[PDB]
């Protein structure tokens, strides 16, 4: 999901 | 790593992680329709999410969780976190909701969207409640962190971090010169308000996936966070 | 009033004295378990429990001092929360199971039978586990239950706003008194107090979720009159 | 309202 990206970024 | 931090260090770390206050779109064109109002709020909330996700990573002990746990907690608490921020911003504006410095709304403007006014009242009541007991910023950041970690923990290390923020809250009250009795009484008062913030979130969420059933187009992210509540 | 005068041990005594009985279900274990029947069972149980809760609230210190209009408001808002924490309390010594009634003890498996219940089931189960590891005391439980009654509807001229808070403060003092008597240190008393109150945010959550489909289950299906009126109060 | 009545009678 999008939420995964923003967390790792 | 979060456990080894001190209470003064805990506060400073939280205050430093504070997300910025964003501005609404500067149309402004008033009064609003229910579509334009929901548009401004949806656009604002979506931009706040990106800052929240980064604020969360800077919450002590939050990066120590698996990526699954981080996601679940945020998915569970995001609207609660948005609301308590809104409530916090609106303290110095009695009877008003400060969504953005260029977007201040009273109860009457809440009637623009089909209630809305019910949530407005609950939000206004929470803001006044904070104003009454003189909620401090250091207390606020602790409460918001508590919401993040606690709201989705019933769905060890987290409870360990939760106890620390409790230790931090007490510290702040002992600093203010409160007696032992006044400390646990005030602590109880603050935490019981979280039950109401939860209630407002659930009521708000219920209407969010009833708006999706197509008043304003929601962002893909705001939809993801919304789908996580069935 | 009168509730402001009570000592900690006095309110504990009064609260323990006011405890409603644990009711039985009309559950016949010589039958399978359908979604409609089970929900009908829990509905019948909740309706009979409501009558005991109403008369229990009257025995909660400070509650009778409030107006009739406000007493109604507090109960309308917190009834399912109160039913749920009572359920969770009954199920403390029954790991992986919920004790709706002494003759009705279901696990997560039999919880699936109702569509959209297994999630609540797990939340109630986790809450009961939470109480178990804390070793939640009965004296603490009755305090939490009184808090829910007075706190849940308080945020929704009127002196009264503050009188409830004064009672809540006294209830906080009581919990602290209990924990100190248990020998806990001050840091331990503050942490445990926080831990208990944070659970109430989850009980609120479970109530909202539970209430949410009760008024979707209302479409179709089997509700009593008092249950329908208190369900009406939410949507 | 039943709840109101029971809170009385
Ligand atoms: C005022 C809180 C606001 C949210 C918000 C936005 C920005 C903040 O800084 C804080 C809270 C919100 C609004 C729109 C969104 O897409 C997401 C959240 C919000 C949240 C849920 C629902 C509604 N509108 C509504 C309510 C009932 C019926 C119909 C509509 C509004
Ligand atoms: C398990 C709690 C139980 C209640 C209860 C009953 C007795 C107690 O002592 C405590 C809780 C409950 C069930 C039916 C009611 O009418 C009222 C409460 C309850 C409450 C709300 C919802 C559900 N499940 C459900 C229903 C329809 C659709 C999806 C899920 C279950």
């Amino acid at each position: 999901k999008i939420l995964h990206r923003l967390l790792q970024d | 790593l979060a456990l080894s931090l001190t209470a003064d260090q805990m506060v400073s770390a939280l205050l430093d992680a504070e997300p910025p206050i964003l501005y609404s779109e500067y149309d402004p064109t008033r009064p609003f329709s229910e579509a334009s109002m929901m548009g401004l709020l949806t656009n604002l909330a979506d931009r706040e999410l990106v800052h929240m996700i980064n604020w969360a990573k800077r919450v002590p002990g939050f990066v120590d969780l698996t990526l699954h746990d981080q996601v679940h907690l945020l998915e569970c608490a995001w609207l609660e976190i948005l609301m308590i921020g809104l409530v916090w911003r609106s303290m110095e504006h009695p009877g008003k909701l400060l969504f953005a410095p260029n977007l201040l709304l009273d109860r009457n403007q809440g009637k623009c969207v089909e209630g809305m006014v019910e949530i407005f009242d609950m939000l206004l009541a929470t803001s006044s409640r904070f104003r009454m007991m003189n909620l401090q910023g250091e207390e606020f950041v602790c409460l918001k962190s508590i919401i993040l970690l606690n709201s989705g923990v019933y769905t060890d290390h987290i409870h360990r971090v939760l106890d620390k923020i409790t230790d931090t809250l007490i510290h702040l009250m002992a600093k203010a010169g409160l007696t032992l009795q006044q400390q646990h009484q005030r602590l109880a008062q603050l935490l019981l308000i979280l039950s109401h913030i939860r209630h407002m979130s659930n009521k708000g969420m219920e209407h969010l996936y009833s708006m999706k059933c197509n008043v304003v187009p929601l962002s893909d992210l705001l939809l993801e966070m919304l789908d996580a509540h069935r």
Side-chain angles (χ1 to χ4, degrees), chain B residues 144-153 155-197:
Chain B
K144 190 167 55 170
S145 298
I146 286 178
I147 290 180
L148 174 61
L149 294 166
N150 174 69
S151 291
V153 75
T155 316
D156 306 331
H157 161 79
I158 301 180
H159 297 289
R160 219 130 48 191
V161 180
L162 279 176
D163 288 331
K164 264 209 60 182
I165 308 182
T166 302
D167 294 332
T168 308
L169 279 170
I170 298 299
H171 187 309
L172 300 170
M173 304 176 188
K175 256 183 171 176
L178 275 62
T179 67
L180 262 46
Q181 185 180 16
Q182 290 178 328
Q183 290 173 28
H184 65 237
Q185 284 188 8
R186 178 168 178 85
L187 169 65
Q189 293 158 9
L190 295 182
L191 300 180
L192 286 182
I193 299 174
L194 301 188
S195 169
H196 179 63
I197 291 176

Coordinates of all heavy atoms in Angstrom, one line a residue, chain B residues 144-197, unseen atoms left out:
Chain B
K144 N -1.0 13.0 22.2 CA -1.1 12.6 20.8 C -0.2 11.3 20.5 O -0.6 10.5 19.7 CB -0.7 13.7 19.9 CG -0.9 13.5 18.4 CD -0.8 14.8 17.6 CE 0.6 15.4 17.9 NZ 0.9 16.6 16.9
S145 N 0.9 11.2 21.2 CA 1.7 10.1 21.1 C 1.1 8.8 21.7 O 1.2 7.7 21.2 CB 3.1 10.3 21.8 OG 3.8 11.4 21.1
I146 N 0.4 9.1 22.8 CA -0.4 8.0 23.5 C -1.4 7.4 22.6 O -1.6 6.2 22.5 CB -1.0 8.5 24.8 CG1 0.1 8.7 25.9 CG2 -2.1 7.5 25.3 CD1 -0.4 9.2 27.2
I147 N -2.2 8.3 21.9 CA -3.2 7.9 21.0 C -2.6 7.0 19.9 O -3.2 6.0 19.5 CB -3.8 9.2 20.3 CG1 -4.7 9.9 21.3 CG2 -4.7 8.8 19.1 CD1 -5.4 11.2 20.8
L148 N -1.5 7.4 19.3 CA -0.8 6.7 18.3 C -0.5 5.2 18.7 O -0.8 4.3 18.0 CB 0.5 7.4 17.8 CG 1.4 6.6 16.8 CD1 0.6 6.4 15.5 CD2 2.6 7.4 16.6
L149 N 0.1 5.1 19.9 CA 0.6 3.8 20.3 C -0.5 2.9 21.0 O -0.5 1.7 20.8 CB 1.7 4.0 21.3 CG 3.0 4.6 20.8 CD1 4.0 5.0 21.9 CD2 3.7 3.6 19.9
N150 N -1.5 3.6 21.6 CA -2.5 2.8 22.3 C -3.7 2.4 21.5 O -4.2 1.3 21.7 CB -3.0 3.6 23.5 CG -4.1 3.0 24.3 OD1 -4.0 1.9 24.9 ND2 -5.3 3.6 24.2
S151 N -4.1 3.2 20.6 CA -5.4 3.0 19.9 C -5.5 1.7 19.1 O -6.6 1.2 18.9 CB -5.7 4.2 19.0 OG -6.0 5.4 19.7
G152 N -4.3 1.2 18.6 CA -4.4 -0.1 17.9 C -3.5 -1.2 18.5 O -3.2 -2.1 17.8
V153 N -3.2 -1.1 19.8 CA -2.4 -2.1 20.4 C -3.2 -3.3 20.9 O -2.6 -4.4 21.1 CB -1.6 -1.5 21.6 CG1 -2.5 -1.3 22.8 CG2 -0.4 -2.3 22.0
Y154 N -4.5 -3.2 20.9 CA -5.4 -4.3 21.3 C -5.9 -5.0 20.1 O -7.0 -5.6 20.1 CB -6.5 -3.8 22.2
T155 N -5.2 -4.8 19.0 CA -5.6 -5.4 17.7 C -4.4 -5.7 16.8 O -4.4 -6.6 16.0 CB -6.5 -4.4 16.9 OG1 -7.5 -3.8 17.8 CG2 -7.3 -5.2 15.8
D156 N 3.5 -5.3 24.5 CA 4.6 -5.5 25.4 C 5.6 -4.3 25.3 O 5.6 -3.5 26.3 CB 5.4 -6.8 25.1 CG 4.6 -8.0 25.0 OD1 3.5 -8.0 25.7 OD2 4.9 -9.0 24.3
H157 N 6.3 -4.2 24.3 CA 7.2 -3.0 24.0 C 6.4 -1.7 24.0 O 6.8 -0.7 24.4 CB 8.0 -3.2 22.7 CG 8.6 -2.0 22.2 ND1 9.7 -1.4 22.7 CD2 8.2 -1.2 21.2 CE1 10.0 -0.3 22.0 NE2 9.1 -0.1 21.1
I158 N 5.2 -1.8 23.3 CA 4.3 -0.7 23.2 C 3.8 -0.2 24.6 O 3.8 1.0 24.9 CB 3.1 -1.0 22.3 CG1 3.7 -1.4 20.9 CG2 2.2 0.2 22.2 CD1 2.6 -1.7 19.9
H159 N 3.4 -1.2 25.4 CA 2.9 -0.9 26.7 C 4.1 -0.3 27.6 O 3.9 0.4 28.6 CB 2.3 -2.1 27.4 CG 1.1 -2.5 26.6 ND1 -0.1 -1.8 26.7 CD2 0.8 -3.6 25.9 CE1 -1.0 -2.5 25.9 NE2 -0.5 -3.6 25.4
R160 N 5.3 -0.7 27.2 CA 6.5 -0.3 27.9 C 6.7 1.2 27.6 O 7.0 2.0 28.5 CB 7.7 -1.1 27.5 CG 8.6 -1.5 28.7 CD 8.9 -2.9 28.7 NE 9.3 -3.4 27.3 CZ 9.4 -4.7 27.0 NH1 9.2 -5.7 28.0 NH2 9.7 -5.1 25.8
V161 N 6.6 1.5 26.3 CA 6.7 2.9 25.9 C 5.5 3.8 26.4 O 5.7 4.9 26.8 CB 6.8 3.0 24.4 CG1 6.9 4.5 23.9 CG2 7.9 2.2 23.8
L162 N 4.3 3.2 26.5 CA 3.2 3.9 27.0 C 3.3 4.3 28.5 O 2.9 5.3 28.9 CB 1.9 3.0 26.9 CG 1.3 3.0 25.5 CD1 0.1 2.0 25.4 CD2 0.8 4.4 25.1
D163 N 4.0 3.4 29.3 CA 4.3 3.7 30.7 C 5.2 4.9 30.8 O 5.1 5.7 31.7 CB 4.8 2.5 31.4 CG 3.8 1.4 31.6 OD1 2.6 1.7 31.8 OD2 4.2 0.2 31.7
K164 N 6.2 5.0 29.8 CA 7.1 6.1 29.8 C 6.5 7.4 29.6 O 6.8 8.4 30.3 CB 8.2 5.8 28.8 CG 9.4 5.2 29.2 CD 10.6 5.6 28.4 CE 10.8 7.1 28.5 NZ 12.0 7.5 27.6
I165 N 5.5 7.5 28.7 CA 4.8 8.7 28.4 C 4.0 9.1 29.6 O 3.7 10.3 29.9 CB 4.0 8.6 27.1 CG1 4.8 8.1 26.0 CG2 3.4 9.9 26.8 CD1 4.1 8.0 24.7
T166 N 3.5 8.1 30.4 CA 2.8 8.3 31.6 C 3.7 8.9 32.6 O 3.4 9.9 33.3 CB 2.2 7.0 32.2 OG1 1.3 6.4 31.2 CG2 1.5 7.3 33.5
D167 N 4.9 8.4 32.7 CA 6.0 8.9 33.6 C 6.3 10.3 33.2 O 6.6 11.2 34.0 CB 7.3 8.0 33.5 CG 7.1 6.6 34.0 OD1 6.2 6.5 34.9 OD2 7.8 5.7 33.5
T168 N 6.3 10.6 31.9 CA 6.6 11.9 31.3 C 5.5 12.9 31.7 O 5.8 14.0 32.1 CB 6.8 11.9 29.8 OG1 7.7 10.9 29.4 CG2 7.2 13.2 29.3
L169 N 4.2 12.5 31.6 CA 3.1 13.3 31.9 C 3.1 13.7 33.4 O 2.9 14.9 33.7 CB 1.8 12.6 31.6 CG 1.3 12.6 30.2 CD1 0.1 11.6 30.0 CD2 0.9 14.0 29.7
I170 N 3.4 12.8 34.2 CA 3.5 13.0 35.7 C 4.6 14.0 36.0 O 4.4 15.0 36.8 CB 3.8 11.7 36.5 CG1 2.6 10.8 36.3 CG2 4.0 12.0 37.9 CD1 1.3 11.3 36.8
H171 N 5.7 13.9 35.3 CA 6.9 14.8 35.4 C 6.5 16.2 35.1 O 6.8 17.1 35.9 CB 8.0 14.3 34.4 CG 9.3 15.1 34.6 ND1 9.3 16.5 34.6 CD2 10.5 14.6 34.7 CE1 10.6 16.8 34.7 NE2 11.3 15.8 34.8
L172 N 5.7 16.4 34.1 CA 5.3 17.7 33.7 C 4.4 18.4 34.7 O 4.5 19.6 35.0 CB 4.5 17.7 32.3 CG 5.3 17.1 31.1 CD1 4.4 16.9 30.0 CD2 6.4 18.1 30.8
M173 N 3.6 17.5 35.4 CA 2.7 18.0 36.4 C 3.4 18.3 37.7 O 3.0 19.2 38.4 CB 1.5 17.0 36.6 CG 0.8 16.7 35.3 SD -0.5 15.4 35.5 CE -1.0 15.2 33.8
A174 N 4.4 17.5 38.0 CA 5.2 17.7 39.2 C 6.0 19.0 39.0 O 6.3 19.7 40.0 CB 6.1 16.5 39.4
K175 N 6.4 19.3 37.7 CA 7.1 20.5 37.4 C 6.2 21.7 37.6 O 6.7 22.8 38.1 CB 7.6 20.5 35.9 CG 9.1 20.2 35.8 CD 9.5 20.2 34.3 CE 11.0 20.2 34.1 NZ 11.3 20.1 32.7
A176 N 5.0 21.6 37.2 CA 4.0 22.7 37.4 C 3.7 23.0 38.8 O 3.0 24.1 39.1 CB 2.8 22.4 36.5
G177 N 4.1 22.2 39.7 CA 3.9 22.4 41.1 C 2.6 21.8 41.7 O 2.1 22.1 42.8
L178 N 2.0 20.8 40.9 CA 0.8 20.2 41.4 C 1.1 19.2 42.5 O 2.2 18.5 42.5 CB 0.1 19.5 40.2 CG -0.8 20.2 39.3 CD1 -0.1 21.4 38.6 CD2 -1.5 19.3 38.3
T179 N 0.1 19.0 43.4 CA 0.3 18.0 44.5 C 0.1 16.6 43.9 O -0.5 16.5 42.8 CB -0.7 18.3 45.6 OG1 -2.1 18.0 45.1 CG2 -0.6 19.7 46.1
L180 N 0.5 15.6 44.6 CA 0.4 14.2 44.2 C -1.1 13.9 43.8 O -1.3 13.1 42.9 CB 0.9 13.3 45.3 CG 2.3 12.7 45.2 CD1 3.3 13.8 44.8 CD2 2.7 12.0 46.5
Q181 N -2.0 14.4 44.6 CA -3.4 14.2 44.3 C -3.9 14.9 43.0 O -4.5 14.3 42.2 CB -4.3 14.6 45.5 CG -5.8 14.3 45.3 CD -6.6 14.8 46.5 OE1 -6.2 15.6 47.3 NE2 -7.9 14.3 46.6
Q182 N -3.5 16.1 42.9 CA -3.8 16.9 41.7 C -3.2 16.3 40.4 O -3.7 16.5 39.3 CB -3.4 18.4 41.9 CG -4.2 19.1 42.9 CD -3.7 20.6 43.1 OE1 -2.5 20.8 43.0 NE2 -4.6 21.5 43.4
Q183 N -2.1 15.6 40.6 CA -1.4 15.0 39.5 C -2.1 13.8 38.9 O -2.4 13.8 37.7 CB 0.0 14.5 39.9 CG 1.0 15.7 40.2 CD 2.3 15.2 40.7 OE1 2.8 14.1 40.5 NE2 3.0 16.1 41.5
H184 N -2.5 12.9 39.7 CA -3.3 11.7 39.3 C -4.7 12.0 38.9 O -5.3 11.3 38.1 CB -3.2 10.5 40.2 CG -3.9 10.8 41.5 ND1 -3.2 10.6 42.7 CD2 -5.2 11.1 41.8 CE1 -4.1 10.9 43.7 NE2 -5.3 11.1 43.2
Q185 N -5.3 13.1 39.5 CA -6.6 13.6 39.1 C -6.5 14.2 37.7 O -7.4 13.9 36.8 CB -7.1 14.6 40.1 CG -7.6 14.0 41.4 CD -8.3 15.0 42.3 OE1 -8.6 16.1 41.9 NE2 -8.6 14.5 43.5
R186 N -5.5 15.0 37.5 CA -5.4 15.7 36.2 C -5.0 14.7 35.1 O -5.5 14.8 33.9 CB -4.3 16.8 36.2 CG -4.1 17.5 34.9 CD -3.2 18.7 35.1 NE -2.9 19.4 33.8 CZ -3.7 20.2 33.2 NH1 -4.9 20.6 33.7 NH2 -3.4 20.8 32.0
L187 N -4.2 13.7 35.4 CA -3.8 12.6 34.5 C -5.0 11.9 34.1 O -5.2 11.6 32.9 CB -2.8 11.7 35.2 CG -2.5 10.4 34.4 CD1 -1.8 10.6 33.1 CD2 -1.7 9.4 35.3
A188 N -5.9 11.6 35.0 CA -7.1 10.8 34.7 C -8.0 11.7 33.8 O -8.7 11.1 32.9 CB -7.9 10.5 36.0
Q189 N -8.1 13.0 34.1 CA -8.9 13.9 33.3 C -8.5 13.9 31.8 O -9.3 13.8 30.9 CB -8.9 15.3 33.8 CG -9.6 15.4 35.2 CD -9.1 16.6 36.0 OE1 -8.3 17.5 35.4 NE2 -9.5 16.7 37.2
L190 N -7.2 13.9 31.6 CA -6.6 14.0 30.3 C -6.9 12.7 29.5 O -7.2 12.7 28.3 CB -5.1 14.2 30.3 CG -4.6 15.6 30.9 CD1 -3.1 15.7 30.9 CD2 -5.3 16.7 30.1
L191 N -6.7 11.5 30.1 CA -6.8 10.3 29.5 C -8.3 9.9 29.2 O -8.6 9.2 28.2 CB -6.2 9.2 30.3 CG -4.7 9.3 30.6 CD1 -4.1 8.2 31.4 CD2 -3.9 9.5 29.2
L192 N -9.2 10.4 30.0 CA -10.6 10.1 29.8 C -11.1 10.9 28.5 O -12.1 10.5 27.9 CB -11.5 10.5 31.0 CG -11.3 9.5 32.2 CD1 -12.2 10.0 33.3 CD2 -11.7 8.1 31.7
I193 N -10.5 12.0 28.2 CA -10.8 12.8 27.0 C -10.5 12.0 25.8 O -11.1 12.1 24.7 CB -10.1 14.1 27.0 CG1 -10.5 14.9 28.3 CG2 -10.4 14.9 25.8 CD1 -9.8 16.2 28.4
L194 N -9.5 11.1 25.9 CA -9.1 10.2 24.8 C -10.2 9.3 24.3 O -10.3 8.9 23.2 CB -7.8 9.4 25.1 CG -6.6 10.2 25.5 CD1 -5.4 9.3 25.6 CD2 -6.3 11.3 24.4
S195 N -11.0 8.9 25.3 CA -12.2 8.0 25.0 C -13.2 8.8 24.1 O -13.9 8.2 23.3 CB -12.8 7.6 26.3 OG -14.1 7.0 26.0
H196 N -13.3 10.1 24.3 CA -14.2 10.9 23.6 C -13.6 11.2 22.2 O -14.3 11.3 21.2 CB -14.5 12.2 24.3 CG -15.3 13.2 23.5 ND1 -16.6 12.9 23.2 CD2 -15.1 14.4 23.0 CE1 -17.2 13.9 22.5 NE2 -16.3 14.8 22.4
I197 N -12.3 11.4 22.1 CA -11.6 11.6 20.8 C -11.8 10.3 20.0 O -12.0 10.4 18.8 CB -10.1 11.8 21.0 CG1 -9.9 13.2 21.7 CG2 -9.3 11.8 19.7 CD1 -8.5 13.6 22.0

